[PDB]
Amino acid sequence: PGCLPAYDALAGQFIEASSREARQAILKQGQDGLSGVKETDKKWASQYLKIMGKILDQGEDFPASELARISKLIENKMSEGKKEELQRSLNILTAFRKKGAEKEEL
């Protein structure tokens, strides 16, 4: 598993922004930054941006719920092939946790 430090930076800038317009601007930067993202890396960059689109309205509550979902799936009877995807999901979702906030077991 891994992450996109480029979009982790954007995630920070996004979720910590009290301005909806500022949030959208940060998302756009990621959307435009795709021009410098590898075809493999785009598989994660897409997730970052989609999550941002939801957080815009829902706040950090959204990825927080998703983290709970992914965590449960890991404990659940999933096939090995899915374990990598679940771990990757946690990293991307975690990036959208408000700075300084308590981190839950994943």
Residues 6+ apart with CB under 8 A from 54: 62, 63
CA distances from 92 to 19, 21, 23, 70, 77 (A): 22, 23, 17, 11, 22
Distance of alpha carbon 69 from alpha carbon 71, whole angstroms: 5
CA distances from 47 to 13, 30, 70, 99, 106 (A): 16, 11, 14, 20, 19
Whole domain around residue 50: which residue ranges?
A: 1-106
Structural domain tally of the chain?
1
Q: How many CB atoms lie within 10 A of CB 7?
A: 28
Tell me the residue length of the chain.
Answer: 106
Q: How was this structure determined?
A: NMR
Distance of alpha carbon 64 from alpha carbon 61, whole angstroms: 5
Return the structure tokens found at 53: 């689109």
Contact between residue 93 and residue 66 where contact means Cβ atoms under 8 Å apart: yes
CATH number at residue 105: 1.20.1150.12
